[PDB]
């Protein structure tokens, strides 16, 4: 039931692919939600990528419950922005993740990027970026002039550093390269620092993080027009009875999962078919106790 809690159907798309901007998931841009509905038919059509602590990234973004995104402008010195690959086709032409910028060499040179971007606002800024893992040394040189890459995303509180690992990977969408995605949060008054020499697929900005009631649910259930305070992967249930047997997974004002298939609560007295000591009177109807 959609009415009480704002449902967002993740049709054909995962939550991470929508965040990154898989061309299918363009419709989800800057849309907020109360509960996301990951589908099992959902697939990833874009560049092959893995992301360490995927579950944490997924669970963190779901708790915020919004893909609101404001673009920021970085002066990428002497590098070719908007890098594209045939792996993520877009209608006719080839393209890339909508929220990431593939930085490659410009005129056979890759200068060390030392870029800065502060956070003057009172709320936390979440930047989503990654690193490219070229399949072979030849592909590495072809993309970036220098031979070995180095990426160090820093902030006043913490620092992340990744080294690209070159090697063969199984061809998926005919692309044997890989991409490791990471995330960094920039607290207010803090400042983001990126010093890279290459292999950097830098971001196009930050996602506005709100600490909210939203969550996620893996389900193949359809959605209809109705009002029900509970949502389970099997479907929506009513919150009348205080115990449920449907599913371990709940969302909202829901009864607690019990192994028992049924629990009969007595609402009348002991039924004794035919004074009172021997049996009760079946004929009596207007009341419960009486005189004959």
């Amino acid at each position, epitope marked *: 039931c959609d009415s009480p809690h704002q449902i967002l159907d993740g049709e054909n798309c995962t939550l991470i692919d929508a965040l990154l901007g898989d061309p299918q998931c363009d419709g989800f841009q800057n849309k907020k939600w109360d509960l996301f509905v990951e589908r099992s038919k959902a697939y990833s059509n874009c560049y092959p990528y893995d992301v360490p602590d995927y579950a944490s990234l997924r669970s963190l973004v779901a708790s915020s419950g919004t893909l609101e995104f404001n673009n*920021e*402008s970085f002066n990428w010195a002497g590098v070719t922005q908007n890098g594209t690959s045939s792996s993520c086709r877009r209608g006719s032409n080839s393209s890339f993740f909508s929220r990431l910028n593939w930085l490659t060499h410009l005129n056979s040179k890759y200068p060390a990027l030392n870029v800065t*971007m*502060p956070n003057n606002e009172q*709320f936390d800024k979440l930047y989503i970026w990654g690193v490219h893992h070229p399949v072979t040394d030849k592909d590495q040189i072809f993309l970036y002039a220098q031979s070995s890459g180095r990426i160090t995303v820093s902030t006043k509180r913490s620092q992340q550093a990744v080294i690209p690992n070159i090697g063969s990977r199984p061809r998926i969408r005919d692309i044997p390269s890989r991409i490791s995605i990471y995330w960094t949060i920039v607290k*207010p008054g803090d400042i983001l620092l990126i010093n890279s020499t290459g292999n950097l697929i830098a971001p196009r900005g930050y996602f506005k993080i709100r600490s909210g009631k939203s969550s996620i649910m893996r389900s193949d259930a359809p959605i209809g027009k109705c009002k029900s305070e509970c949502i389970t992967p099997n479907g929506s249930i009513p919150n009348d009875k205080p115990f449920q047997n449907v599913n371990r997974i709940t969302y909202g004002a829901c009864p607690r999962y019990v192994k028992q298939s049924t629990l009969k609560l007595a609402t009348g007295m002991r039924n004794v078919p035919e004074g009172f000591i021997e049996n009760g009177w079946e004929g009596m109807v207007d009341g419960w106790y009486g005189f004959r």
Partner: antibody, heavy 129, light 109 residues
Framework: QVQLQESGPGLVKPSETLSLTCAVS????????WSWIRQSPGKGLEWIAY???????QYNPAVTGRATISLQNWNNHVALRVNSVTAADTAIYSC???????????????????????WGQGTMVTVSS | SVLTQPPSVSAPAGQMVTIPCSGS????????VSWYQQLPGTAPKLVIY???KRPSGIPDRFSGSKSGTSATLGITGLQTGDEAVYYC??????????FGGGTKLTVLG
């Protein structure tokens, strides 16, 4: 070492739209509030509008709603278009930076600053035919 | 021009000057103040941000003040290079920026 350089046309036919940009250097355009101010012989020194990457924007009422401030990320420029130009609109047009406000607003964004940090030289626009 | 300031003042080199900036209570009484110097043919420069504070590279020679509806800019020990126009300005009620008329500072001697 942040600088501004206002690129602009020299003349503009009356009742037409006026295109304008100023290039920013050594600083992301999204990091500060920007506003345009224009100086004219007569009619004082006139602020027109301010912008911020949030989308917050205020225009001066004395200039009709014809002015619309944009800002662009690819070229790292902040831009300004004003349609239906009259003869009065002739002036030098400069872009300038606000002092960071150091106190957010409703919904978390930084407010516009109470002072103009630095100015570009500016470009003279002439309303001639 | 909802901010009043005298068109021109004059003083010998090495002396003090006072530029007043009269306004209503809707602007200065509520908001802060800023002073801007525009040397001839150059982009206007900021001289005093907020009420008494001066940016880096602005000598303590320049000094500012506020008092209800009026604001005051002061310069001790004048140089010939200080000949310029000086603008006071601030926000008002409607959050629209207003500058003063202008003050053409001439230095004699």
């Amino acid at each position: 070492q942040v600088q501004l350089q206002e690129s602009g046309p020299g003349l503009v036919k009356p009742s037409e739209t006026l295109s304008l940009t100023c290039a920013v250097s050594g600083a992301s355009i999204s990091s500060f509030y920007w506003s345009w101010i224009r100086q004219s012989p007569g009619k004082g020194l006139e602020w027109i509008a301010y912008i911020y990457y949030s989308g917050k924007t205020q225009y001066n009422p004395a200039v009709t709603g014809r002015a619309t401030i944009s800002l662009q990320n690819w070229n790292n420029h902040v831009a300004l278009r004003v349609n239906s130009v009259t003869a009065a609109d002739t002036a030098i047009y400069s872009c300038a930076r606000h002092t960071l406000a150091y106190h957010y607003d409703d919904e978390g964004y930084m407010q516009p600053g109470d002072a103009f940090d630095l100015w570009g030289q500016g470009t003279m626009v002439t309303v001639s035919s | 021009s909802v901010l009043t300031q005298p068109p021109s003042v004059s003083a010998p080199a090495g002396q003090m000057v006072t530029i007043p900036c009269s306004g209503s209570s809707s602007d200065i009484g509520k908001s802060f103040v800023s002073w801007y110097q525009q040397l001839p043919g150059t982009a206007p420069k900021l001289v005093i941000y907020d009420n008494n504070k001066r940016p880096s590279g602005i000598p303590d020679r320049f000094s500012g003040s506020k008092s209800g509806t009026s604001a005051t800019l002061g310069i001790t020990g004048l140089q010939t290079g200080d000949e310029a126009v000086y603008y006071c300005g601030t926000w008002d009620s409607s959050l629209i920026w207003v500058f003063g008329g202008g003050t053409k500072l001439t230095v004699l001697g």
